[PDB]
Amino acid sequence: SRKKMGLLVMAYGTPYKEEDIERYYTHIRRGRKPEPEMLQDLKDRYEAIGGISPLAQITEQQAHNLEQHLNEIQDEITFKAYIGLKHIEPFIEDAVAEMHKDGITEAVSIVLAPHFSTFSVQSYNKRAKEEAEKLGGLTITSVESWYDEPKFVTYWVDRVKETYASMPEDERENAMLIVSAHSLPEKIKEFGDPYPDQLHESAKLIAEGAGVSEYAVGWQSEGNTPDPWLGPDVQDLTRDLFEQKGYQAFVYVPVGFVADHLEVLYDNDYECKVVTDDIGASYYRPEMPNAKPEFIDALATVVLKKLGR
Ligand SMILES: [Cl-]
Ligand SMILES: [Cl-]
Ligand SMILES: [Mg+2]
Ligand SMILES: [Mg+2]
Ligand SMILES: [Mg+2]
Q1: Which residues bind Fe(2+)?
Q2: Is the Cα torsion angle 291, 67, 8, 21 positive or negative in sign?
Q3: Of 142, 66, 135, 68, whose CA–CA distance to 96 is shortest?
Q4: Can you tell me the distance from the alpha carbon of 199 to that of 143, in angstroms, rounded to the nearest whole number?
């Protein structure tokens, strides 16, 4: 009696093993293979964060739990999850072609990145729809953003509350909250890309809900191109804020990311920790959503709301 629908879960993607590093970054670098020294460094970074194997598993677990949960909280639709990635197989097109072959005719998509941007989200959705249009007989409704879903805000608000609560007294009174997301080229502004504003809005909503009056907005993990990228970078912001007010502790909320991957386990947990360790301040970074029940419910609500349920 249920209506069959495809659940297209898209994401950036991650290597499955150390030997994937080369091709994964070549793709990210738009066809330019990393030099020998860079390849070695990347391997060292992944080893330092506990290994690669767990990365892709988080995404698979996210897609799977979301599929099971949605199927349990409503009784009108039966969802079937398909993972589509940008930088490694299964690619976005591959997932769409599979849904078609399996007989899916109606699907709903969601990107594992809360803020809309013309660079990624719009591109992912555009590519999924074009593949479906090319195959025919299949339509897709795409979630464009969900950073403002109350349940998602609540997740971070609660994590931040716990973090400040566990803080000593003299730290709680001189702590700074830094909310960040993946940095992108500044040129996106020429299209009126709401990306920057959505990050600032997430920061305001999380700070307000947690009761934190002192916070800043930062970017991280910027790529390497001649054109300028959104700033300031979390590393510089941390130092700059310290040099002007001398905070004793920094709380990092990489709201732009949803899992324990390299741009949090290393770009925050290591690179940011280096700076805080250097200035003599305490480092804090709340648990990422990953595949936890609270997060999966938030995502389920996002999907159902998109479908008018
Ligand atoms: Cl939407
Ligand atoms: Cl949006
Ligand atoms: Mg091996
Ligand atoms: Mg919206
Ligand atoms: Mg970097």
Answers
A1: 182, 263
A2: positive
A3: 135
A4: 17
Which residue is listed with tokens 């971070």?
156
Q: Which amino acid makes up residue 118?
A: T
Question: Cα(146) to centroid of ligand 4, in Å?
Answer: 6
**Greatest CA separation for the chain:** 63
Question: Do residues 3 and 78 lie in contact, with contact meaning Cβ atoms separated by under 8 Å?
Answer: yes
Lateral strand order in the sheet of 77-85: 77-85, 3-11, 106-111, 139-142
Q: What is the resolution of this structure in A?
A: 2.0
Binding residues: 12, 19, 29-32, 45-46, 53, 124, 182, 187, 263, 267, 271
CA of 223 to the centre of ligand 5 (A): 7
- Solved how? X-ray
Å from CA of 221 to ligand 5 middle: 4
Q: What DSSP string runs through 70-129? A: HHHH-SSEEEEEEEEESSSSSBHHHHHHHHHHHT--EEEEEESSSS--TTTHHHHHHHHH
Domains and CATH numbers, the chain: 2-146+289-309 (3.40.50.1400), 147-288 (3.40.50.1400)
Task: Spell out the alpha helix ranges (H) of 166-292.
Answer: 169-172, 195-210, 234-245, 262-265, 271-279
CA of 111 to the centre of ligand 2 (A): 12
Residue 160 · residue 213 · CB < 8 Å = no
| Cα distances (angstroms) measured from residue 279 to each of 74, 234, 240, 247, 262 | 51, 14, 11, 9, 24
SS3 of 14-53: the string is CCCCHHHHHHHHHHHCCCCCCCHHHHHHHHHHHHHCCCCH
